Design an enzyme around this catalytic site. Sequence first.
Site, PDB file in Angstrom:
ATOM      1  N   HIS A 140     -69.679  47.983  24.088  1.00 19.66           N
ATOM      2  CA  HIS A 140     -69.825  49.087  25.023  1.00 19.66           C
ATOM      3  C   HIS A 140     -68.477  49.512  25.591  1.00 19.66           C
ATOM      4  O   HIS A 140     -68.204  50.712  25.740  1.00 19.66           O
ATOM      5  CB  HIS A 140     -70.781  48.676  26.137  1.00 19.66           C
ATOM      6  N   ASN A 155     -83.206  45.451   0.028  1.00 19.55           N
ATOM      7  CA  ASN A 155     -81.959  45.718  -0.691  1.00 19.55           C
ATOM      8  C   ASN A 155     -82.182  45.717  -2.197  1.00 19.55           C
ATOM      9  O   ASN A 155     -81.684  46.596  -2.910  1.00 19.55           O
ATOM     10  CB  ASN A 155     -80.900  44.672  -0.356  1.00 19.55           C
ATOM     11  N   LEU A 178     -84.908  46.203  -3.859  1.00 18.65           N
ATOM     12  CA  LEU A 178     -85.605  47.436  -4.202  1.00 18.65           C
ATOM     13  C   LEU A 178     -84.622  48.592  -4.360  1.00 18.65           C
ATOM     14  O   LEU A 178     -84.631  49.295  -5.376  1.00 18.65           O
ATOM     15  CB  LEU A 178     -86.641  47.763  -3.132  1.00 18.65           C
ATOM     16  N   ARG A 226     -68.622  46.095   2.130  1.00 17.78           N
ATOM     17  CA  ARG A 226     -69.341  47.002   1.243  1.00 17.78           C
ATOM     18  C   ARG A 226     -68.592  47.027  -0.077  1.00 17.78           C
ATOM     19  O   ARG A 226     -67.414  47.394  -0.105  1.00 17.78           O
ATOM     20  CB  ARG A 226     -69.417  48.413   1.831  1.00 17.78           C
TER      21      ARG A 226
HETATM   22  N1  LIG Z   1     -73.913  59.440  38.217  1.00 19.27           N
HETATM   23  C1  LIG Z   1     -75.165  59.563  37.705  1.00 19.27           C
HETATM   24  N2  LIG Z   1     -75.894  60.695  37.845  1.00 19.27           N
HETATM   25  C2  LIG Z   1     -77.141  60.794  37.326  1.00 19.27           C
HETATM   26  N3  LIG Z   1     -77.771  59.815  36.635  1.00 19.27           N
HETATM   27  C3  LIG Z   1     -77.153  58.630  36.426  1.00 19.27           C
HETATM   28  C4  LIG Z   1     -75.786  58.443  36.959  1.00 19.27           C
HETATM   29  N4  LIG Z   1     -75.401  57.199  36.620  1.00 19.27           N
HETATM   30  C5  LIG Z   1     -76.433  56.644  35.934  1.00 19.27           C
HETATM   31  N5  LIG Z   1     -77.476  57.488  35.815  1.00 19.27           N
HETATM   32  C6  LIG Z   1     -78.756  57.174  35.124  1.00 19.27           C
HETATM   33  O1  LIG Z   1     -78.831  55.775  34.795  1.00 19.27           O
HETATM   34  C7  LIG Z   1     -79.120  55.608  33.403  1.00 19.27           C
HETATM   35  C8  LIG Z   1     -78.475  54.364  32.805  1.00 19.27           C
HETATM   36  O2  LIG Z   1     -77.086  54.310  33.109  1.00 19.27           O
HETATM   37  P1  LIG Z   1     -76.100  53.318  32.296  1.00 19.27           P
HETATM   38  O3  LIG Z   1     -74.640  53.628  32.537  1.00 19.27           O
HETATM   39  O4  LIG Z   1     -76.569  51.905  32.590  1.00 19.27           O
HETATM   40  O5  LIG Z   1     -76.381  53.767  30.751  1.00 19.27           O
HETATM   41  P2  LIG Z   1     -75.977  55.222  30.149  1.00 19.27           P
HETATM   42  O6  LIG Z   1     -74.923  55.870  31.019  1.00 19.27           O
HETATM   43  O7  LIG Z   1     -77.253  55.995  29.935  1.00 19.27           O
HETATM   44  O8  LIG Z   1     -75.297  54.892  28.709  1.00 19.27           O
HETATM   45  P3  LIG Z   1     -73.811  54.240  28.519  1.00 19.27           P
HETATM   46  O9  LIG Z   1     -73.989  52.873  29.110  1.00 19.27           O
HETATM   47  O10 LIG Z   1     -73.537  54.203  27.032  1.00 19.27           O
HETATM   48  O11 LIG Z   1     -72.825  55.099  29.289  1.00 19.27           O
HETATM   49  C9  LIG Z   1     -78.630  56.882  32.748  1.00 19.27           C
HETATM   50  O12 LIG Z   1     -79.381  57.197  31.585  1.00 19.27           O
HETATM   51  C10 LIG Z   1     -78.815  57.943  33.817  1.00 19.27           C
HETATM   52  O13 LIG Z   1     -80.092  58.585  33.702  1.00 19.27           O
HETATM   53  N1  LIG Z   2     -79.321  44.128  -4.241  1.00 20.69           N
HETATM   54  C1  LIG Z   2     -78.004  44.435  -4.294  1.00 20.69           C
HETATM   55  N2  LIG Z   2     -77.395  44.657  -5.470  1.00 20.69           N
HETATM   56  C2  LIG Z   2     -76.092  44.957  -5.548  1.00 20.69           C
HETATM   57  N3  LIG Z   2     -75.285  45.063  -4.486  1.00 20.69           N
HETATM   58  C3  LIG Z   2     -75.756  44.865  -3.240  1.00 20.69           C
HETATM   59  C4  LIG Z   2     -77.179  44.532  -3.074  1.00 20.69           C
HETATM   60  N4  LIG Z   2     -77.391  44.383  -1.758  1.00 20.69           N
HETATM   61  C5  LIG Z   2     -76.200  44.605  -1.147  1.00 20.69           C
HETATM   62  N5  LIG Z   2     -75.211  44.884  -2.020  1.00 20.69           N
HETATM   63  C6  LIG Z   2     -73.782  45.217  -1.712  1.00 20.69           C
HETATM   64  O1  LIG Z   2     -73.228  44.470  -0.626  1.00 20.69           O
HETATM   65  C7  LIG Z   2     -73.027  45.378   0.473  1.00 20.69           C
HETATM   66  C8  LIG Z   2     -73.272  44.636   1.778  1.00 20.69           C
HETATM   67  O2  LIG Z   2     -74.673  44.526   1.923  1.00 20.69           O
HETATM   68  P1  LIG Z   2     -75.249  44.512   3.396  1.00 20.69           P
HETATM   69  O3  LIG Z   2     -76.763  44.503   3.403  1.00 20.69           O
HETATM   70  O4  LIG Z   2     -74.380  43.432   4.017  1.00 20.69           O
HETATM   71  O5  LIG Z   2     -74.795  45.939   4.017  1.00 20.69           O
HETATM   72  P2  LIG Z   2     -75.447  47.388   3.738  1.00 20.69           P
HETATM   73  O6  LIG Z   2     -76.736  47.282   2.950  1.00 20.69           O
HETATM   74  O7  LIG Z   2     -74.362  48.266   3.173  1.00 20.69           O
HETATM   75  O8  LIG Z   2     -75.674  47.926   5.236  1.00 20.69           O
HETATM   76  P3  LIG Z   2     -77.078  47.915   6.022  1.00 20.69           P
HETATM   77  O9  LIG Z   2     -77.981  47.045   5.178  1.00 20.69           O
HETATM   78  O10 LIG Z   2     -76.744  47.284   7.361  1.00 20.69           O
HETATM   79  O11 LIG Z   2     -77.478  49.374   6.083  1.00 20.69           O
HETATM   80  C9  LIG Z   2     -73.998  46.541   0.227  1.00 20.69           C
HETATM   81  O12 LIG Z   2     -73.707  47.801   0.836  1.00 20.69           O
HETATM   82  C10 LIG Z   2     -73.772  46.669  -1.240  1.00 20.69           C
HETATM   83  O13 LIG Z   2     -72.456  47.229  -1.341  1.00 20.69           O
HETATM   84 MG   LIG Z   3     -79.485  44.759   4.498  1.00 27.43          MG
HETATM   85 MG   LIG Z   4     -71.923  54.297  31.714  1.00 28.64          MG
END
Ligand SMILES: Nc1ncnc2c1ncn2[C@@H]1O[C@H](COP(=O)(O)OP(=O)(O)OP(=O)(O)O)[C@@H](O)[C@H]1O
Ligand SMILES: Nc1ncnc2c1ncn2[C@@H]1O[C@H](COP(=O)(O)OP(=O)(O)OP(=O)(O)O)[C@@H](O)[C@H]1O
Ligand SMILES: [Mg+2]
Ligand SMILES: [Mg+2]
Lengths: 236, 243, 243, 236
Positions: free
Chosen positions: B36, B148, B150, B193
């Site tokens: 974050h 995968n 598949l 990858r």
């Molecule tokens: N200054 C503000 N004015 C209005 N609403 C707010 C404010 N600060 C927080 N909020 C509300 O609180 C919620 C959660 O806040 P938090 O910072 O925990 O997550 P976020 O801001 O939604 O996402 P990120 O953590 O990625 O910034 C927000 O979705 C928003 O609706």
């Molecule tokens: N069944 C498979 N046959 C051949 N190569 C594979 C197979 N599964 C994965 N790989 C290769 O290894 C990489 C890493 O696999 P992994 O599941 O770690 O990540 P990803 O599938 O790319 O991402 P995500 O699954 O999180 O969307 C794959 O993107 C592909 O490049």
């Molecule tokens: Mg996977």
């Molecule tokens: Mg925030």
Amino acid sequence: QEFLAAGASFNQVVTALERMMTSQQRLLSDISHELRTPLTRLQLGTALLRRRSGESKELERIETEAQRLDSMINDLLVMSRNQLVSETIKANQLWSEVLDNAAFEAEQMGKSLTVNFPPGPWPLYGNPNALESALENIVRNALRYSHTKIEVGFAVDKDGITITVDDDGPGVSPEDREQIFRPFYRTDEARDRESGGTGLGLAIVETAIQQHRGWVKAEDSPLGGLRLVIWLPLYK
Amino acid sequence: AGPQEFLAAGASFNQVVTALERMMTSQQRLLSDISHELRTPLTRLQLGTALLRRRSGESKELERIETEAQRLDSMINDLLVMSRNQQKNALVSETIKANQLWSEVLDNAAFEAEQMGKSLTVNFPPGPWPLYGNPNALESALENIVRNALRYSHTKIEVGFAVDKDGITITVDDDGPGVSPEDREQIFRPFYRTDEARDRESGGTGLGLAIVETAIQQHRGWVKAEDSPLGGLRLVIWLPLYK
Amino acid sequence: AGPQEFLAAGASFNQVVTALERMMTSQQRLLSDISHELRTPLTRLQLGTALLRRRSGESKELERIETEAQRLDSMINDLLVMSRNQQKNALVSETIKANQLWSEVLDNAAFEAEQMGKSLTVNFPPGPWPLYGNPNALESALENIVRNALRYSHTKIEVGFAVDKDGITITVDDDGPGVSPEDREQIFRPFYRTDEARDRESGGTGLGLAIVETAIQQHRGWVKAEDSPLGGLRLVIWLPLYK
Amino acid sequence: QEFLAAGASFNQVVTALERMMTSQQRLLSDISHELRTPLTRLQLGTALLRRRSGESKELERIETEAQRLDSMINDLLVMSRNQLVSETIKANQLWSEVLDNAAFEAEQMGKSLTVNFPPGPWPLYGNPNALESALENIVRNALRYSHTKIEVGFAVDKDGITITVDDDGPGVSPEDREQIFRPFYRTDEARDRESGGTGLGLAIVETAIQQHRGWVKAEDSPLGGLRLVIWLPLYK
Ligand SMILES: Nc1ncnc2c1ncn2[C@@H]1O[C@H](COP(=O)(O)OP(=O)(O)OP(=O)(O)O)[C@@H](O)[C@H]1O
Ligand SMILES: Nc1ncnc2c1ncn2[C@@H]1O[C@H](COP(=O)(O)OP(=O)(O)OP(=O)(O)O)[C@@H](O)[C@H]1O
Ligand SMILES: [Mg+2]
Ligand SMILES: [Mg+2]
Ligand SMILES: Nc1ncnc2c1ncn2[C@@H]1O[C@H](COP(=O)(O)OP(=O)(O)OP(=O)(O)O)[C@@H](O)[C@H]1O
Ligand SMILES: Nc1ncnc2c1ncn2[C@@H]1O[C@H](COP(=O)(O)OP(=O)(O)OP(=O)(O)O)[C@@H](O)[C@H]1O
Ligand SMILES: [Mg+2]
Ligand SMILES: [Mg+2]
């Protein structure tokens, strides 16, 4: 030896547990290594720019926001294999840079950010990184969820520092105002908003302030939007 | 404290593992919190490039900066999703039998395969074999191996269970393209990858198989990546029996 | 400061590299100092096992503790030796021609091979090609590839130089046993030893090839480990030309 | 782009330098990872012993000397990718544990270790690890190169702390007494001695004390062997 099946060598259980218990540390330690190398490239690019086009306020900005990223990647690689750390800090030292950045970013947003009263050399004891994160998050929440104005005020007394952040955005209804410090939570109004993002912000704030014996409130803001108040205690 | 220390104390099997589960949810939070907080300076950095553009114009250097930033941007987003899922369903190991654990998973690979005009053959099905671990985690670990296989298969997929006194051995095979013997090493790494899925792209986090390795090792089992006889990728998961 | 920063400033090629050389001797000291200071608690730990023995007697657990301690003991000793050598002859990059650089090295592989009743064939010899780097480091990097190929070969060794506009490519081949395609990945890691040299043992630090990779990358070249056509291990080093 | 040959892509120089400049950090970072895993095994063994044979003074010793090793391995993985750090510390907090260990080890040697006067709550500012290492090394030098007695005395005044370590071993001839703080150096008498080891000890001492604005001497010792005097300054 109750941990693998009934007949595994002693060396087998030793290694079986060693994998079991180092597995998340190694995942983080590797996730850390992996973020580093594209950052390292990004930093070489900026070096190569400063070598060509020379110094530049925009460049220096990239150059240091890089360094912030490099520092935090090094925090992951540390606290992964470790599983708490605290020191003494003055409040101006702590949060000044956080606010200056809040300013630069507020200007890019075309929004007014005003600091009614600034942090003084006030004694805190805790985690520098955590407290910065606490302030930065409620401020940038305000930067975003605001219409135009954002206000920040510090206040000190014998007992401690009280930070108050105000915005003129939409409020947070009283009911939602409690639950918005809970992780991954977003007001119904905000997930509907074109704004997207994990509800983690205020949750990080609450756990940083509560771990320093402080507190956080969300309230009505005189500015029309939402007021966020942090309170921390001073150090002996 | 450290689950190793619970072990050192003399606590039950169950206690040692819930201690581990504890340390995990901690490391899991540390992950999703740092994720974050990397977005913050990134956003500022990309505010900076944007301003550098409007000033000194396009650049080979600027283009590098911006694309490594967008790469960092993407990984952090992949990372937040991951730990959001991990911290959605809770970490609760329990005793569970292998056919209860994976039957519904397999009956879906069946269906998903038929939708795709590919075949899935379960050579030996899972039996009523005792495992101890996280049912959501183990379920998901197999679904991903198979989903995968598949995807990356040319025509057919083969799942095979084997039990003995020491534990269960699951083997998944596809007749797709292989994985070069060098990439067989590093496919369980985060963000990895093979350049081929990197050629097609179509997204892809590189995290899934890293989750599986970490998950299995936490169940005291293991995973290997071998050449499949079917032509493509063979994955093998072993897990110990419980008593 | 950081050699990257010298680069960022606009300093000469030569300055950027002596900045790197500087950061290196620092990291080199940090290494040999920490190595020195790990022996202290180790000595105390082994004082403790010794006393645990004279008390509660032999143990499967105690035996594990003692052998992992002796392993740590050995690595730290290997580590001190290494950086003592690195910090013996100084880090001074300079311009040097490839035949000056490696001719004497090769004429010795020649002799060492004849002593061993094995053959060394230099397919194409190194030419008067400009390199920039550490002559002790580069010399040594080749001697070790080749002294290894002499050792692990069955009968013959082949060294081959190739030059083009971009740089020099050295290829070393032996007709010994291979290196499994999976260990070809990890042989440049510190302390790594394929289980076969680990079967014979006869010592062996596991550091040498890790030194080579780190050394070449610092010269802006690279190293690969491939199957050799001769049967055994092929090593390839590339390095850029200088102007 | 003066760094590879005359025609390499921009991406090629970017990666070429990135390898060049991260190569020693990655070697250390990996040397670090590699030391960790056998230690992790060694720690699981001790856990498994405490689970079976239960608590034990010898065990607890192994258990914590393990932890010292784990901490320093984590220092390598940090300062490899970093390329200075300091804090405030009291002298008793600093060196007490160093001395207690010196005691346990002196007893195993069957040698007398006496602390004429101990460190008090005296203010220093610097690197805790470095200063511990400075004291430990001259003390254990004395533990080893001595015949029977080893003496350690602390002294404080407004200007700072003066540590004096004495042994009844062979001296160091006046000439050798300067050069023995230089790296990898050993007196002709000591490499002849069955004692073996890198001449790094006193060299680590001199650079830790000089980096805290202090000094070190080797002198004649009233005990008959060698006297080592450290002097550090207090903190404002
Ligand atoms: N200054 C503000 N004015 C209005 N609403 C707010 C404010 N600060 C927080 N909020 C509300 O609180 C919620 C959660 O806040 P938090 O910072 O925990 O997550 P976020 O801001 O939604 O996402 P990120 O953590 O990625 O910034 C927000 O979705 C928003 O609706
Ligand atoms: N069944 C498979 N046959 C051949 N190569 C594979 C197979 N599964 C994965 N790989 C290769 O290894 C990489 C890493 O696999 P992994 O599941 O770690 O990540 P990803 O599938 O790319 O991402 P995500 O699954 O999180 O969307 C794959 O993107 C592909 O490049
Ligand atoms: Mg996977
Ligand atoms: Mg925030
Ligand atoms: N020519 C070769 N053929 C086959 N295997 C090799 C060859 N050279 C090295 N290896 C394998 O890779 C391992 C690592 O090599 P490296 O030089 O890194 O360490 P080492 O030779 O064991 O130790 P050191 O060279 O420091 O005494 C070797 O021990 C051996 O197991
Ligand atoms: N207390 C002492 N009595 C006699 N000689 C000493 C004493 N302390 C140091 N020396 C001399 O100084 C030399 C170098 O000391 P230093 O601690 O720097 O390295 P070392 O002790 O030889 O090896 P190591 O650093 O591995 O302990 C020693 O070889 C020894 O001859
Ligand atoms: Mg070698
Ligand atoms: Mg010493």
